[PDB]
Amino acid sequence: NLTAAESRIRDVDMAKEMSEFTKNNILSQASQAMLAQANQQPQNVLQLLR
Amino acid sequence: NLTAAESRIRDVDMAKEMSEFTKNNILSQASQAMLAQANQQPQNVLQLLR
Amino acid sequence: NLTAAESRIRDVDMAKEMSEFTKNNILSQASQAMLAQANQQPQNVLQLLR
Amino acid sequence: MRGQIRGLEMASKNSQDGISLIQTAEGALTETHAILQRVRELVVQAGNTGTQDKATDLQSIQDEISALTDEIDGISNRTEFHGKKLLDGTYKVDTATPANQKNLVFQIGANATQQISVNIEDMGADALGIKEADGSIAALHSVNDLDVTKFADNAADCADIGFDAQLKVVDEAINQVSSQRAKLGAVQNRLEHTINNLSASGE
Amino acid sequence: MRGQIRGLEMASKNSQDGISLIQTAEGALTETHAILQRVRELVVQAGNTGTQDKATDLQSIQDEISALTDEIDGISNRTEFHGKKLLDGTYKVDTATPANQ
Amino acid sequence: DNAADCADIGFDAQLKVVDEAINQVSSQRAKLGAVQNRLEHTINNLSASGE
Amino acid sequence: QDKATDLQSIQDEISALTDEIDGISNRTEFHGKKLLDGTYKVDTATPANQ
Amino acid sequence: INHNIAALNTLNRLSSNNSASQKNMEKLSSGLRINRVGDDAAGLAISEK
Amino acid sequence: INHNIAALNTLNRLSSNNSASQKNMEKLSSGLRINRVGDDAAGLAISEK
Amino acid sequence: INHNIAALNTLNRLSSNNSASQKNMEKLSSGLRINRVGDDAAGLAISEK
């Protein structure tokens, strides 16, 4: 019972923590896409310059 | 922890440093546009000459 | 114990050395990107020429 | 404004460095803590074997225990971040003269009084106590565990030979280490919240 | 007219600066709020563990809680925009003397 | 030796005086730019007087 | 976090920056007249010296 | 305006999400949500006694 | 940042877990938790007298 | 006036912005903001000890 309790504290629902892992990766890479699109506006400003 | 600390010192937020890279390029090329327009006034002075 | 010691000297943490391998590749290819962007300024100078 | 901003980025880096310092302390306290687990086992079977084994075998168990102790003093006297020993009594939580506390006041912001204090205290003599540890008890119970030949003299009813007292003070040392680690991890959480705040201020 | 206009552009910039000030306050309140989430968890398992754990372990949980509190006072006493603390009791919604608001 | 409570070793005092120096420099620069604006207005006035 | 030594290194950088401050205040000249230095104290104790 | 993209918040966001992934790895490689002392202090001390 | 992955802790973790597996083999191939002198000293000496 | 365009400041500006881009490349090709000793001295020495 105490090894069970310790486990419920210390251990990980590694299935759930993997779904979370995936999720955080997708959020990172999505933010990276938003960065890629974000760095495209000043060039349009340059098109306006010439 | 010390490799982490060294990294926080030595390394680059290369995403941020790329957004900066882009930015500095756009400022350069914009200044170049301003040069191109700047070299057009003396010719108008010449039009005034003849 | 001596085969262990020799191994600790001679052998490679090939996991770590692969993470390093990847890393050095990314630094190379990144430097190559910086070269690609570096060779774009003289052409803007040419745009200023005409 | 600009000065504030650049000092806020530097504030983020500051708090990150502080977290790392703490993580060093927490690896050290982690290993120390595992040592105290092993010690606790050795005290329990010192309990039974004080009524199965001889004083000799208890001297052997004691040799193992004292070795583990020398590792405790070792970690407390080698654990350094930027060459500054953290675990040792350098940062006594409350010195008798409060001037001597030398508290870890990390920078958290970019302006005055935007700091957080931290304290650490751990070594061999990290057992029970009030202001000092104590004498025959509660300092050596982490340094020189009594299960030498003493333990065969009595079961629990001397308070400095007794099983119950000794083990109680082992669990006390584990309580102090666990408390310290808990505080430090809490500081890490705090500093994380601060990095986010500084990020928004930079925005 | 011209004076009005230039003051209207300045009015736009004014309100934008105000939004930013608020955004600072909202990052601060965001982190404070997440702290209170953690606290709530600690109070719930303080609920059960008040009938599983000892008063000692509740003292440890309490150490974590008080730390989180010191972060609350921290954010309320460090959150500044143009060096002016926003969250603290400087701007009590209704002072007993309304002159002090 | 100390955190903030000597006024000549303290963090808060030192940093406060750094921001003070920045305040004096920024004040100076502000005055000077103001002089530039003033002088611009004067050039325009002189231009009209020349007209 | 750091020792008094590392603070001596930071101090070396700071004092260098200072020597640049005195430098700019003792080199900034227009028509060979130093402007930034104490030549034009805003309010001399003797106002004749302003 | 060019000196300041609004999407710097995407960089703070990206660093935060990365840090999330870092905690995820430290929990999955270890199988422990108490891998580091931080992120659960009380639960640690309970689990340790 | 590229010179330093956070998942180097996965390599220290991986070396530790491997070492655990190594002790496991040394105990299962031998059937002895006192296979090497280390990892139980007092229990050894008791078991030896 | 013809011997002196006001936009010479665009040339000093352009050289400065170019130099910024140069530092950017030296940081991105290297992944190091301490690539050269300059631009962070104290941080270097700390990172070096």
Numbering used by the authors:
A (entry chain A), B (entry chain L), C (entry chain B): 255 to 304
D (entry chain V): 52 to 254
E (entry chain f): 52 to 152
F (entry chain r): 204 to 254
G (entry chain r): 103 to 152
H (entry chain A), I (entry chain K), J (entry chain L): 3 to 51
Please quote the paper that reports this structure.
There are three parts to the flagellar structure: the trans-membrane basal body that functions as the motor, the connecting rod and hook, and the flagellar filament that acts like a helical propeller. Our current understanding of supercoiling in bacterial flagellar filaments, referred to as polymorphic switching, is based upon the notion that protofilaments within the flagellar filament can exist in two discrete states, that differ slightly in length.
The L-type 11-start helices are tilted left by ~ 1.7° and the R-type 11-start helices are tilted right by ~ 3.9°. These include three straight mutations outside of the D1 helices: S17P, S285P (both within D0) and the double mutant A39V/N133H (within the loop region). We also identified several straight mutations that are only involved in the 11-start interactions: S17P, H84R and A39V in the double mutants.
